[model samples]
Target: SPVRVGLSVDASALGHTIPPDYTGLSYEQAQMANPNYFSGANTQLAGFLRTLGRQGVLRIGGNTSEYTFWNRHAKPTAADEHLAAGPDKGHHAAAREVITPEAVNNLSEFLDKTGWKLIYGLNLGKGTPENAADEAAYVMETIGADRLLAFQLGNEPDLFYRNGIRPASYDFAAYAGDWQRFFTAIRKRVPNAPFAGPDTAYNTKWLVPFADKFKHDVKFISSHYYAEMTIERLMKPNPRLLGETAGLKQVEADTGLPFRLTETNSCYQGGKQGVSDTFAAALWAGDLMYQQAAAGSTGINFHGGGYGWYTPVAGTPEDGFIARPEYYGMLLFAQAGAGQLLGAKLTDNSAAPLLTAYALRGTDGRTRIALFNKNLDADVEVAISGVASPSGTVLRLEAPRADDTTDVTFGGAPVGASGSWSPLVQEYVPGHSGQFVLHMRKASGALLEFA
Candidate 1:
């Protein structure tokens, strides 16, 4: 299979913002959070991003994006707030959780340390055009708008109704009109800015129409997906939530609009704590990137964080930072998604449905092949058939106990939790895990090249 498809990064991917407040926690309040996750972001997260490649699109806003959940609603579900069912029911809620000094400062600290660029998102829920502009000014002043790619007006306003923040009767047409107004209003101040969106949630219908009408108006078109709870399972699934094939087709149909999976995960809401956060999820996530690339997706990001009814990943209680099953998936992608994607083809060997594979070439002549297997029960052998093999091959395997703590090991090495990212690295499936030379095992993927 000599079909060599290269991935053009939507550039700005990866989510920004913390859990929703009721808006959840204030800047000063979240700063007071136990085991602070370093507001701006941490060296670990940025380093993690580079571990992938360059930051083409580092998106900063999401559903529970950056708004202090406690602040917006003033009474968020316990699922979102910290110390749920605790005292201080609604007293010192966060005004602007993420953009606030403590919030932005923490992120700034991380960005400065990691040296990654950014595409920030502003709050639109319960936020004014003035606040959006002001926050943009603050972020620009702090991160220096130069490093800051661009700012989004809101997270996913189209889904705001779903969140019960607005009536279901809310106007999509009017929303778009308002979005334009916000865009126009922001430009009045920031002056020169590149934009991306239709930051809509799980609603490609709106995305298509929105992008159609505003294709020229925005820098890029964006959409979000979670597969859907109704379609959780493919065969058993009534609708099959989060299938890569569908995600690809939709993006393909979009044609010219630069599409980004802006946010994706195994499950929609919080993620199936068991499967949504498992090592299997890693395989799914790794495949997700390739699928998007195959279908012409500009970029694909795995969403996480301690927000909403659920998230693919969660901030660690110990460190007050984020960690989960999907984190490992993104981390692995970051590791191998870099370099140039090599031309690969399915040389289907066994019936067990071998994992999907992608071969990539590094500047140093390393041919990295990332794989993903779908069958949870059976394992299959993989006979790679794309190109001549090189040396310096490695296999990173990640499997989860549940879906959260995926023990990663290299070549069957013992897994640990001490790394720049999550402990999933300890479980790294050695490039040669069950893989011998060119042949791969049933339950893993490989990153191989010349030594």
Candidate 2:
């Protein structure tokens, strides 16, 4: 007998509204190595971003944000060259890199071409308040306030001590002082500047305090989350990830401010080679996006750049760009587009413990259901109830195998290099007595839609 699972979706009980700009990507500030990496001239990059959504967020920050400098006539220093020379080195490990006005201009054009907003990160770890303020001013002037989301002051301040960016004694209060100086300086220069912060690497301890102190000073609380580094650990349903978001939810309730996972992915430290770059990552990341949105997160930015193992869209303009397996996960979530999350419950999931389900009532009055079956050996038969319509269509997120990297596809087709995608096939699922049965394959996901 097929593994039986029951899904209940309550359209009346609407949850968080998944914003149009919820889908986002985070890249290192040092991606400016090519200067035109994020520019309008980078049509491949823009096309890929546009494929994710007509409206989205482009976050320019990462570990490199800490070491990045801004100068109108900036040139690559010897340290930057040396850091870029190592086999194991990437932009995230840059020593001291400079971003010029040319790059900023290109970034603005890129934003325009892709119809995405910018969440720019200003250097704060080893940067002075004056320089940060000057950089912020130029960014605002170049990108224009309308296209700018907010300015993140630092990357991961909680790990500054460990990373040698701050003294070991640097605590919340100490960092608060420095943050205030930068905040005051930037606000003074760009009076209407929008800001978000406390981009903690993995520490939730910093969220509440930072929120309480800077509640009025910033637009939203931000942080990063990376699951276990191995494929097995990442593909499983981990409680720690839930607990972390539960804490973030409490912070939001206590401070009345929304939270954004400004930086996140399957694994930390550049991700795991085979896991983060494979088909399993697509399922993992796609499920993670819905989980975060249901938890009331304002948005999620999957961090990627260069040839990082976890980069969703990999490669550079010189060599051309390609959509990795994780990118398909993003594309899968983008299928929801803009909508209000509906209450969805799955029971009898014990047989397939890794199965996950989500429902969204799209703004178009169509209901969409997402089912992720992470079980490697069990194919679950799901009976869905309480859908507004009795008939629906299904699109499958599939690959040759869980570990296969290059053969991932959604709706039976791969997204093209120019970011073009159309479902090659969609199965019509008919309802019987208001219940629709979907046979979900192991290690795959299904997007079910009803008019």
Candidate 3:
């Protein structure tokens, strides 16, 4: 039995060109636990980065960043008062550890070896402008200017007021004022210091005012988001729901600064145990990439850390590194989603509306199509319009079921220890007299390439 649908591509229309360093990874300030986690001492880590792209961005900062302090001269012997633990004694502790010059030095060496860039987050919660300025100066001097992307001032400022770090009256005006003070201080020490901020959550309106006042000072607009949490929400998530970009798009239109989802993932709190570590997560990631790229985003950095559900590359440097399911999904995008997003349309006349498609044509003359079928148990018969090629290869991202934690493979293979992956290539699933038909397996997706 064959089901029919319509499709079309506009060769004339084009959208945002994916940035060269579009794919990135975000880690916590704690990852600086030792040089091994980031530095070249971990050859396996280098292999993973190389496999993704020769060059990428690494963001170091999170909850621990708010309390981080520098120790250039010597490791601080005793903890300072501000470094003292908060009353909560709960999860978010004040980062009292010293960020040694040796630590920075080792990281720089690692970046040099791997050709990755760094977007370091400086302390903005309890740190002084002078201290932050010195840290910026030290980083510039040690890492050199070329390797630095931009220094993020804070993580999520909207929560600062609610978190009791600032007065209840704390708002964008207060944030902007404090940000300017810190910027001015940092500028005095490091005259050419670059920054990216008002990194907030839900309150995208902050972008308008910040860009209005400090447009010249800001390099990129940053924010964070997570699709859903818990098993209930993850089991039945709509991919379209994850690509809400009206606020982000408005900022881009108003500010003209490249908007970036500096931090994002499927679920919050280090991701759901089973949900974030499955094939569905991969499909969700792929859909998110296309939606953001199509909406003119600068880049997206998936947050990851050691032995967590949200982590794409898990395992310790001591044990090894592995590209999890989410990595494979993003890898599929990286392999095909370069250059501009070409216009495309997908139609399904069936009773269940369950298909989404995106097409891209690179400046390098490469063309690729991304398709997803949300139908859980029925294979979709698809007729691709504007594709003249008689035959083309299809690369799939799949598992036995959306909840499956193992046996998931992208391009017919799992990423090996050596960072090598060979794509599964085969002709489109034939259907009808002469039309190029694709059998989109239930609860799965594929990347089709012609030319």
C-alpha positional error of residue 294 in candidate 1 after TM-score superposition, expressed in Å: 2.0
The TM-score-based order of candidates, best leading, equals 2, 3, 1
Tens-place lDDT digits, model 2, residues 207-251: 899999998899888998888666667777676697778767987
Candidate 2's C-alpha runs over 4 A off are: 75-93
Model 3, stretches more than 4 Å misplaced?
A: 1-3, 75-91, 230-244, 349-354, 424-434
Residues 125-199, model 1: lDDT tens digits: 656776666666666777776567556666667766666546787667867776787777677777766677767
Q: Return the number of clashes found in candidate 1.
A: 74
Question: Backbone clashes in each candidate structure, one number apiece?
Answer: 74, 0, 0
Clashing pairs in 3: none
Give the least accurate 10-residue stretch of model 3, judged by summed lDDT. 81-90
Off by over 4 Å in 1: 1-58, 65-99, 229-255, 307-323, 347-350, 390-392, 398-406, 411-418, 421-442
